[PDB]
């Protein structure tokens, strides 16, 4: 329902993006 | 490889794919079915691919001579970026390389979008 | 939400294209 | 606020801001609308901001690779100062920081003019 999905998704994208950055350094 | 070596290797890889197209024009087709100029990490590499596509569409050989002569005008490619592409060593089987350029591209687009999103959220 | 949705959708498409590739 | 701590804070804030620009190269337009290289406390950070401004005018990515490629090579940024900038944590909303960086720049300019006024008075 509503924009609940547009949080699971964005957060999904932010988690993937963060995963790729963390996997590029340190 | 640290992050720096990876970015340096993406740049190198683009040169090698493009060099291969200069030495074997017909590959522009198999490479284009995956890549657009927009997918190139180093912009001048993108403008080079963009000139080559245009040459191929009209059946004019893709070489140093024609790349320069038909080079845009409003937009140019620096002398060293040109030399660095032409001078890269052509390898066989650039399938992997082409795939890494496309992968790297999707990663960047994801990053741009990830930013823009957390940006509109203020 | 407006342009962001279109950007996420086209991004999603460039993604599945890599698999549809064959 | 200890004076030393403060200074260290200013240096740390400048990196986080520069590190943030590396994460979202578009943020350089906003930051530049309030900051010039000369406004950075630690000179190497200003030099960095400078190369970045140049890289963005050429639409070239601002990353570890190109920052090191576009370095003046007559003048260079010591590796420790680079890893300092690249390793710092990109924050969300570096606004206050940018205005903080600008504020301390103005203070230093205030202090400089104060000294030339004192010096050029004691003939």
Chains C and D touch (3+ CB pairs under 8 A): no
Give the CATH number for residue D86: 1.10.860.10
Experimental method: X-ray
Residues of chain D found within 8 Å of residue B12, distances taken between Cβ atoms: none
**Contacting subunits of C (3+ beta carbon pairs below 8 A):** A, B
Task: Give the domain range for residue D87.
Answer: 1-123
**Hey, what are D111's tokens?**
């202090």
Instruction: Choose among D92, D88, D93: nearest CA to D42.
Output: D88
Chain A residue numbers touching D22 (CB-CB < 8 A): none
Do residues D13 and D104 lie in contact, with contact meaning Cβ atoms separated by under 8 Å? no
CA within 13 Å, CB half, A14: 13
Cβ contacts of C14 within 8 Å, gap of 6 or more: B106, B109
* Among C8, C9, C11, C15, the residue to mutate for chain A (most A Cβ within 10 A): C8
* Interface check B115 vs D, CB under 8 A: yes
Q: Phi-psi region for residue B42, left (φ > 0), alpha (ψ -120 to 50) or beta?
A: beta
> Cβ contacts (< 8 Å) between D88 and chain A: which residues?
none
State how far residue D23 is from chain A, nearest Cα, in angstroms.
Answer: 10
CB contact under 8 A, B118 and D92: yes
The pair of structure tokens assigned to B3 is: 């992050």
Distances (CA, A) of B119 to B9, B54, D14, D17, D32: 30, 37, 20, 15, 17
Pick among B101, B103, B107, B109 to test the C interface (most C CBs inside 10 A): B109
* Sign of the torsion formed by the C-alpha atoms of B63, B68, B71 and B75: positive
């Amino acid at each position: 329902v509503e924009e609940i999905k547009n949080a699971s998704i964005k957060r999904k994208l932010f988690g993937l993006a963060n995963t790729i950055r963390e996997q590029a350094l340190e | 490889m640290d992050h720096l070596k990876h970015l340096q290797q993406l740049q190198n890889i683009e040169r090698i794919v493009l060099s291969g197209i200069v030495l074997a024009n017909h590959k522009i087709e198999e490479v284009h079915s995956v890549l657009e100029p927009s997918d190139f990490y180093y912009p001048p590499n993108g403008l080079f691919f963009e000139i080559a596509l245009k040459l191929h569409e009209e059946d004019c050989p893709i070489d140093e001579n024609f790349i320069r002569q038909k080079m845009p005008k409003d937009k140019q490619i620096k002398e060293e970026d040109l030399v660095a592409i032409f001078a890269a060593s052509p390898i066989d089987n650039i399938e992997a390389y082409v795939e890494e350029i496309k992968n790297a591209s999707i990663k960047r687009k994801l990053f741009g979008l990830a930013n823009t999103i957390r940006e509109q959220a203020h």
